[PDB]
A paper describes a structure:
pmcSterile alpha motif (SAM) and histidine–aspartate (HD) domain–containing protein 1 (SAMHD1) is a dNTP triphosphohydrolase (dNTPase) that hydrolyzes dNTP substrates into their deoxynucleoside and triphosphate (TP) subparts. First, the enzymatically active SAMHD1 tetramer is formed when dGTP/GTP and dNTPs bind to two allosteric sites of SAMHD1, A1 and A2, respectively. In addition, SAMHD1 dNTPase activity restricts HIV-1 infection in nondividing myeloid cells. Here, we investigated the structure and functions of SAMHD1 R366C/H mutants, found in colon cancer and leukemia.
For both the R366C and R366H mutants, we crystallized the HD domain of SAMHD1 (residues 113–626) in the presence of dGTP, which is capable of binding both allosteric sites 1 and 2 as well as the catalytic site of SAMHD1 (29). R366H possesses significantly lower dGTPase activity than WT but is more active than R366C. It is possible that the substitution of a positively charged histidine residue at position 366 is able to mediate minor coordination of the negatively charged γ-phosphate group of the substrate dNTP, whereas cysteine cannot mediate this interaction.
Author numbering:
A (entry chain C), B (entry chain B), C (entry chain A), D (entry chain D): 113 to 277, 284 to 599
Write the structure that this text describes.
Amino acid sequence: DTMKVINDPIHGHIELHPLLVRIIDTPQFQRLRYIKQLGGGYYVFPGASHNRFEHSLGVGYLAGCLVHALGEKQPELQISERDVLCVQIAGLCRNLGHGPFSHMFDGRFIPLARPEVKWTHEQGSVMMFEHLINSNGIKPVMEQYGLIPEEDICFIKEQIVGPLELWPYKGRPENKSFLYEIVSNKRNGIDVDKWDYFARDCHHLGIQNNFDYKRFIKFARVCEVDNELRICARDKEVGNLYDMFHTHNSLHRRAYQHKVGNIIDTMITDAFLKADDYIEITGAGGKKYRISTAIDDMEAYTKLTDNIFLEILYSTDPKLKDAREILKQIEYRNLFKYVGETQPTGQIKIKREDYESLPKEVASAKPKVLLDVKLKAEDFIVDVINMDYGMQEKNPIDHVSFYCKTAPNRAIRITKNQVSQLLPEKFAEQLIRVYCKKVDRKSLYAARQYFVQWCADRNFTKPQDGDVIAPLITPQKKEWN
Amino acid sequence: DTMKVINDPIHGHIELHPLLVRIIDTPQFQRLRYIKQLGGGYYVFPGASHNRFEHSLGVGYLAGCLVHALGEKQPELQISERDVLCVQIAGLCRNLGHGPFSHMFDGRFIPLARPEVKWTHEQGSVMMFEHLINSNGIKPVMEQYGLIPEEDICFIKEQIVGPLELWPYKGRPENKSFLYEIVSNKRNGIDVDKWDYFARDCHHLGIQNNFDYKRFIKFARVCEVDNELRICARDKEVGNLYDMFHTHNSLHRRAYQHKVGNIIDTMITDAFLKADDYIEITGAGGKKYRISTAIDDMEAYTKLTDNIFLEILYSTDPKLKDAREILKQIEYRNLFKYVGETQPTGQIKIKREDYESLPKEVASAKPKVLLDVKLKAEDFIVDVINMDYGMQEKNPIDHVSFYCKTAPNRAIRITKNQVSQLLPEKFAEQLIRVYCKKVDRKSLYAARQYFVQWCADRNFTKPQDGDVIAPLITPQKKEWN
Amino acid sequence: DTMKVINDPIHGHIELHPLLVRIIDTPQFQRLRYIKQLGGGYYVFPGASHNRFEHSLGVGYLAGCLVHALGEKQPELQISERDVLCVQIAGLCRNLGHGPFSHMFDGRFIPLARPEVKWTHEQGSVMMFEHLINSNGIKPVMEQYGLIPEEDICFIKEQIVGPLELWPYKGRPENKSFLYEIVSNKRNGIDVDKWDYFARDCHHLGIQNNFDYKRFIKFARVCEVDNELRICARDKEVGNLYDMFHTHNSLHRRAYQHKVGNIIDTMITDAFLKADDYIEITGAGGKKYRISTAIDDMEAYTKLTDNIFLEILYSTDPKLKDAREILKQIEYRNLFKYVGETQPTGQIKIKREDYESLPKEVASAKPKVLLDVKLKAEDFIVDVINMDYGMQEKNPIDHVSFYCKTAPNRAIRITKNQVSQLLPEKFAEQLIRVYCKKVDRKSLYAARQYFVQWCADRNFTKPQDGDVIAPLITPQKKEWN
Amino acid sequence: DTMKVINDPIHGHIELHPLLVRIIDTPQFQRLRYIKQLGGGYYVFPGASHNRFEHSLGVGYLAGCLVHALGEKQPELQISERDVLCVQIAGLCRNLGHGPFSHMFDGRFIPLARPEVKWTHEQGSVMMFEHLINSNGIKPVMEQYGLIPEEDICFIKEQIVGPLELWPYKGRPENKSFLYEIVSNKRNGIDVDKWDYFARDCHHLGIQNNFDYKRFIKFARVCEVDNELRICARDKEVGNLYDMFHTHNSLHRRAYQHKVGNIIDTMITDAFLKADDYIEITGAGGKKYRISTAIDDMEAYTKLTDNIFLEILYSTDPKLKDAREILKQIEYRNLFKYVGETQPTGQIKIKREDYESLPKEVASAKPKVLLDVKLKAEDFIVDVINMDYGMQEKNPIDHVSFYCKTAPNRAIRITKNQVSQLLPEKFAEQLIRVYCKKVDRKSLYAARQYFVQWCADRNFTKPQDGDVIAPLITPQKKEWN
Ligand SMILES: Nc1nc2c(ncn2[C@H]2C[C@H](O)[C@@H](COP(=O)(O)OP(=O)(O)OP(=O)(O)O)O2)c(=O)[nH]1
Ligand SMILES: Nc1nc2c(ncn2[C@H]2C[C@H](O)[C@@H](COP(=O)(O)OP(=O)(O)OP(=O)(O)O)O2)c(=O)[nH]1
Ligand SMILES: Nc1nc2c(ncn2[C@H]2C[C@H](O)[C@@H](COP(=O)(O)OP(=O)(O)OP(=O)(O)O)O2)c(=O)[nH]1
Ligand SMILES: Nc1nc2c(ncn2[C@H]2C[C@H](O)[C@@H](COP(=O)(O)OP(=O)(O)OP(=O)(O)O)O2)c(=O)[nH]1
């Protein structure tokens, strides 16, 4: 077997080592062809047809590029082809755990269907990787190309999910610490996964990408930091790193958290919950699983993709009627109606455990407007979105090491004041979107009154359209006037 | 209801009239989200994730652009908003008839499954359009925006499939003849459908586009030709028009007729044929249809998409075992092996009626080589591909009208000799690809000997790798030496 | 005479009205072919070969696009083709006043050569426009295409420089106030000039533009604000407007204020000052002007371009030896050496009249380090750069009017807190770059010590490389560590 | 002292070895900043502001890419860093010999000014390279980085101009023959110089490039051909190679041989001829040269750039009045008027010796039309353009070696019939453009009659607009009817 070339629209001609080809040509990997990268986003951005499969190839490619470039610039690092292949495999395989419509499945569906369980795509990726290796006799092939399966499978899993539990990693020692910063960077979030989707999502969405990963790679070096060898950026590049996170935030606002994209994801999740008792997925030993339980058996999970959406939509079973009708409403674009958006003020943060109480609170508000219809908790959806620079309220640039032209081996820190006074003072916030399941002109008018009243009651920010949608409510609040 | 904006990666911000929105937001239209533009092409170009739906939006947009630009430059044409909307709807809806994996369904599957029937995606588009209109109460909405359903539905169908059957059209008179040249140009093949997929397919494939549709539109005018008003191009654009067809041919060789893309389409078609007796699709009145018969009932056809591939792949029914195993082999990349390509010489053209005889002919060849295994007709696939400039052997530029700067209202013809002696002397040819279902080293060696012998016997062109794959065979033929 | 088409790499096919063609085809306009958009930037970004000429065509085009789009969406505005042509001419002509190397001439050279005079490129553009009109008999051509020269020439000049010599404008009344916001927006800086150079500079520099002007135009409307008709943006676009200024700041940091680009501009300015007594430029009546006085006669200024650089570089006159030697040093790349960058802390602002005292201050600093060479005021250059959102310390988004979907005719304001807590808290800052004219290793070491000491003395920010370039100095300051 | 990074819009971040930096930072190299790549093309495509300097950096970069990729894939080639640097320097320096407005100088001006001399930009590049090396003490720096000046300077010159004189090269032996195919490919014209300008010119012109050099590099290998090691392409890539030359032809038609671009180059050449007696350029020992004689002294040639255009345009000397007036007419766009284009039929080829007789022939034609004005030889310009695939009438693909996947070390040939019957039957042709120096309506009408009559007399092709511009003439010729 020899190397294969793939032509990617983002990266151009990608060379794949024969071991990588063997991992890719499995049911467990090919499954990613049937999961949309941006899930419900496709229903708002018709260009966003792209699947997790091509994203995965790109992450593998970029992982290879970064590790190769470090090895070429700094031969003293003793980066081995074995190291390169392991970093490529981790890059290729870190998306294996995604379920139907990607972030909708682990972000929305599993939390509601299985509140007791703690599930992440990262955990899923490790389980599916193990299933891929074991089901397809990969370990012999790994040894053929000079890999140490016990050590290297551990190394690959650690790159994906972090320590599997003082140096906490078993796959590689402290002198190769920098290898763990490439595929999934737990220290500051600067990794090749972000670089691929920035470029790929933008290409498909019709938004332009402001971040130059190629420049970052050219200016990356490994330096000693606190007795670890770590990837350091050139001091001058600090502005571009702030801009990388700015780009991420912009993509979330414009696309990933698009108000309609989110409500379509919500409606699909509701359809999946109503279908969950009736859809059967055959796993290991012919045992039957549900959408919600396929995560417990990787053989079943292998066959759980966006297809479930079409199975429900095209079904005739009366049991699936309620689920089917929700998806049919999506096709007619009879969506739950966006009422508006607000933000908590100051340090106020809404907790996960409180999310279910929020619809009741909106319905409980007393507007001081004559209302045609009276709305109930069940008529409202409240979506809370945490927007940050990937480290909650921490500045990720405080967790980056830099080097200077005059001393390229010496790691330094750069503080925010050393860069620009025009940068963000805060690095996290919450967006609260409210929608109404009643699409009536009178119901929507009522929903707007409840919403703006709830905002005033809770001292949330004035909705941007507040003076138009609720002219009788907005005056009461002095902060808004 | 008001206009909606869609952000497309190819076209940027597209405005959609509310009537267009109502047509788009139907099960019959949204179905195109679940049919890949390039079918098996996605399995060779991982970027080609794009579906018929986003292509359809683009064709609608470009149809609007061309008709608007003509109206702005030449108010004397009396192009009406009613005309603009009808051209947009035809552009939007000309892809409605595509089936699973697009050209695979009407190009490969239906011809083999239902040899008696004459089926085209164009015919399918007209039937699905009628079903869309009737199922969703569109006619009242058409009248609301100033359309006359009887005349305008006729006009839209005629733009898609041509005369429904001396001016042969009923939807519009001879003074609006140019409107029929926009969406599906039967005269010379220069239409907005080609312009969208050139740009869209290239964007996704990773291949570059060498055609400027925007320039064509800027230089397009309507002039009188033989008592018809027709779209004329500026004389100096003739080179760019030859290049447009050159681009089309390049995309076919590189992507649409990729040898592996074609064999994957062949293998999927074979799986569909083996599954056809057992897959049931519920149509009108709860009646059950097969993959092959869903084309007879638009309610059933509405639910026939690429999903059928996954229904088969994920099935447990023993009846579907043979179909399922073919798709599983695709996932393992255990594909039928490409043996080589040849061309007929001179005028020789192979017709469909003896396509089935070609595998037997290859197996019947007697290469003067000692062979380990002896191969049978059933072990060979022979794929014949007609490559042309869209009008069989004819030069489409002989069917284009031009105008000169000094007389912009006066239509002229331009001959090939007036342009360049570097242009093609022929405008059609055939490619013959041969594959072997036996994938072992000995069988592949034997297949290569049979193939090159068959080429020599039939006076076909010397395979490019002929001297390497069959060094004992190639010397016999003097034309090759 | 009819419309001409120009193919621009940024905008594609641009249509130019015959009146626009007549203005463009003059010595006064064609002169912009010989002035680089980014001046010294070309010597750092080899792609930045682009001249003011092609920028001007783009500004004219975009001015036309915006005014046309407003007129199409809101016919009630009664925008006339006379209005469209006047806005296009202003867009085309607002760059006519630029001198050699663009911002270097009005930003650096004229302030030093002629401190008494107040000169701007805007004033220059008005003078050159008048000279263009009068020298080329344009007024008759304006009348031929329905313009009224007296009113319309006033309107065009007002669009370029603002109120010519209570509604302060004479060219158009308050009901056409929005027309003054297109070409040069004095209210908030959102104008088509910025949109062209963002896209054009990025195309040439090799950095990507993430501002979407086309989307802005689609969402622009005219609404009543304080008894004026003004351009309003859609409320939801507020994020993209913050991002537009973010983009502008990024382009300044990365390119326009590149430390080496700036020093090359400084060195060229110094060469021009030393050549100013000796270069003669023939103006009106054969009278002779200097580089510094050509601004006083538009006939002379017509012949003042980047060519002056080459006239000096290629000169043999002993009088020009000092000027010539500076330019020759640029070619050998031995330029003045960058020592470092610092910022004033908090609100501290360095005044224009204090700039010349700063080199003396650096030379006067007493670093507690043993020094091989002692440097003098003349050996230092101190460059102060004001970085802002185009309205000094003011937030330009406080000066933008928005509209909501539910009330598209009703203008609203949006405050920073209503948008995001991640946005800048400040909208202006100063960067201070220090360079040394002595390039030897010993002199550069000394320059670094003086610089970091000066920073500590003045409580400026710690240079990013401070611990490397001045390890003995940095410890003294506790704020730095 | 270390590598420098340059951000190029085409190639992104380019790394330059310190030796390359030293060669670049010289008057002889920096001179290329003041010569437009496409000369008069800028006066038709305002985007084409790009200079020979940035093209040169790109050619150096791509030369490096190809040699590096071959070395990585085939270590057995024993490609050395010394080899890599020499190939990069040749790539960087092969444009050093270009004069004002690039191809205008060696294509039009020198042939007319100095008919006795044989001058090429390639010869100029070798002379300027020698001058660069000797003037700037480069030889010591070459030795510092492991080059052997005697052998390596020979090798570099040979890559640029071919043998300086059975193996005809002295710089490297037959086992490194493939190195001579990278920078300037005399065998088939497939070189990195073409790859850079295709991408760079397209970026600036606003035309799209359909050639993928990156793919070519990935599929390039070295194989033995007739006892030489040569670069071979993968068999499958033959289509893309035909397309590469198709792209080159398209760029020539659309841009490089644009009818107006060519006439502006003609008018500038005429201005240079009229100025040649009076412009003085100081060379070595203070000796004075003319535009036409600066090629004899590299010190003088160093100072001969596009600036000469502005020196003439801005001059006051009465001696330069005639030259100055031609350039002033260019600014007013009072260009010689395009009359039309024709082609010789069959094999007929117009010789260089005959070019001057062609204006007389047009003026001598007797159109059967009543004419207001009678035109003379001096009133006509006849421009003859040879359009080919870079090897006159030969197919360059007949001069390419390929390899097959089954035998990657075995070189093969591919014939045209093995590829496609849709490819060109001829690989060279001539375009004849005619212009009139008399621009008035009556003179232009007369010029059109003479031109179309001359075409009929000489059995040239029917002008595209023939029936519009000469309706009385076209009928006489029955080949045209
Ligand atoms: N731009 C372009 N890409 C192509 C063309 N033909 C194939 N590709 C792309 C599609 C796939 O990503 C890949 C096809 O495989 P390669 O050509 O790299 O060769 P390989 O030997 O790996 O596979 P193969 O046997 O050719 O299918 O390259 C072509 O003519 N042009
Ligand atoms: N390039 C770009 N595209 C955007 C941006 N924001 C949204 N888009 C895309 C998403 C959609 O395809 C289109 C605009 O859709 P909207 O965001 O207005 O969504 P929708 O129509 O559901 O909202 P609305 O009717 O205004 O409540 O453009 C942006 O800032 N930049
Ligand atoms: N992409 C492309 N651009 C072209 C081509 N020929 C010219 N251009 C450029 C030159 C100009 O900037 C622009 C269009 O100008 P034209 O020369 O076509 O002018 P116009 O239409 O007035 O025609 P004319 O020259 O009077 O026959 O496009 C071509 O074949 N392709
Ligand atoms: N893409 C990109 N290119 C940039 C940026 N800033 C500068 N460039 C360009 C300028 C140069 O052509 C190249 C890198 O040069 P540098 O910025 O490193 O400048 P320089 O070598 O003077 O810096 P140094 O001496 O190392 O401090 O990229 C940026 O933010 N993004």
